[PDB]
Design an enzyme around this catalytic site. Sequence first.
Site, PDB file in Angstrom:
ATOM      1  N   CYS A 268     -20.749 -14.952  25.240  1.00 44.69           N
ATOM      2  CA  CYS A 268     -21.219 -15.518  23.990  1.00 44.69           C
ATOM      3  C   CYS A 268     -20.018 -15.943  23.183  1.00 44.69           C
ATOM      4  O   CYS A 268     -19.044 -15.195  23.095  1.00 44.69           O
ATOM      5  CB  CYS A 268     -22.049 -14.487  23.215  1.00 44.69           C
ATOM      6  SG  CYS A 268     -22.726 -15.118  21.634  1.00 44.69           S
TER       7      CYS A 268
ATOM      8  N   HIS B 177     -31.023 -17.408  25.390  1.00 49.02           N
ATOM      9  CA  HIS B 177     -29.826 -16.904  24.688  1.00 49.02           C
ATOM     10  C   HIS B 177     -29.787 -17.446  23.257  1.00 49.02           C
ATOM     11  O   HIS B 177     -29.559 -16.692  22.302  1.00 49.02           O
ATOM     12  CB  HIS B 177     -28.579 -17.322  25.484  1.00 49.02           C
ATOM     13  CG  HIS B 177     -27.270 -16.871  24.900  1.00 49.02           C
ATOM     14  ND1 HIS B 177     -26.456 -15.932  25.508  1.00 49.02           N
ATOM     15  CD2 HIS B 177     -26.606 -17.279  23.792  1.00 49.02           C
ATOM     16  CE1 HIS B 177     -25.360 -15.770  24.785  1.00 49.02           C
ATOM     17  NE2 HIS B 177     -25.427 -16.574  23.741  1.00 49.02           N
TER      18      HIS B 177
ATOM     19  N   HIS C   9     -30.469 -15.665  19.418  1.00 51.89           N
ATOM     20  CA  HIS C   9     -29.579 -15.709  18.252  1.00 51.89           C
ATOM     21  C   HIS C   9     -30.364 -15.926  16.963  1.00 51.89           C
ATOM     22  O   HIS C   9     -30.036 -15.338  15.939  1.00 51.89           O
ATOM     23  CB  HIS C   9     -28.558 -16.838  18.345  1.00 51.89           C
ATOM     24  CG  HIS C   9     -27.304 -16.499  19.096  1.00 51.89           C
ATOM     25  ND1 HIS C   9     -26.399 -15.557  18.651  1.00 51.89           N
ATOM     26  CD2 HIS C   9     -26.786 -17.009  20.238  1.00 51.89           C
ATOM     27  CE1 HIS C   9     -25.382 -15.500  19.493  1.00 51.89           C
ATOM     28  NE2 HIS C   9     -25.588 -16.376  20.460  1.00 51.89           N
TER      29      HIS C   9
END
Length: 137
Positions: A85, A127, A131
């Site tokens: 990340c 992903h 967030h």
Amino acid sequence: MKILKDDAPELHAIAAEVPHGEDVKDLVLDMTAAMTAAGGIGLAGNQVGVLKRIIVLRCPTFKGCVINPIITRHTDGHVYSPEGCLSYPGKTVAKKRRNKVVVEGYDMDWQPITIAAKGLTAFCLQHEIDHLNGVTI
Ligand SMILES: CCCCC[C@H](CC(=O)NO)C(=O)N[C@H](C(=O)N1CCC[C@H]1CO)C(C)C
Ligand code: NI
Ligand SMILES: [Zn+2]
């Protein structure tokens, strides 16, 4: 823009729905520029301190933005997805992800979009949407 430090509260905060029709064109340009400058294949608003539900991607089967992305369909069970990340440089985590997803939302011109994705592109979408919910690897 800047990719926020790993201890930033925004990374754990929930991003707000973008009001329908809001002009997000400059924001998406800036986010795309931050993503490529940092060497990523996706980015979410939270990562640049923008608590709005906007993601940008440059993945194998999808390149562009999604405003108010939602997962409307996914496969059962999970597969292995090794992920780093941009907000936590240095770390790679073996994540469990759905192998296939459909994501729906809007483009920069507020046209409805649907993305059917598998493998890496599906992993990226999950992903980035994570967030937006303050969920990180
Ligand atoms: C893979 C699922 C989506 C990852 C997106 C991140 C960018 C990010 O933090 N988005 O929020 C990235 O580019 N990560 C890279 C990454 O994890 N990659 C790039 C190739 C595939 C995978 C490594 O297994 C690097 C920078 C660590
Ligand atoms: Ni900048
Ligand atoms: Zn990330």
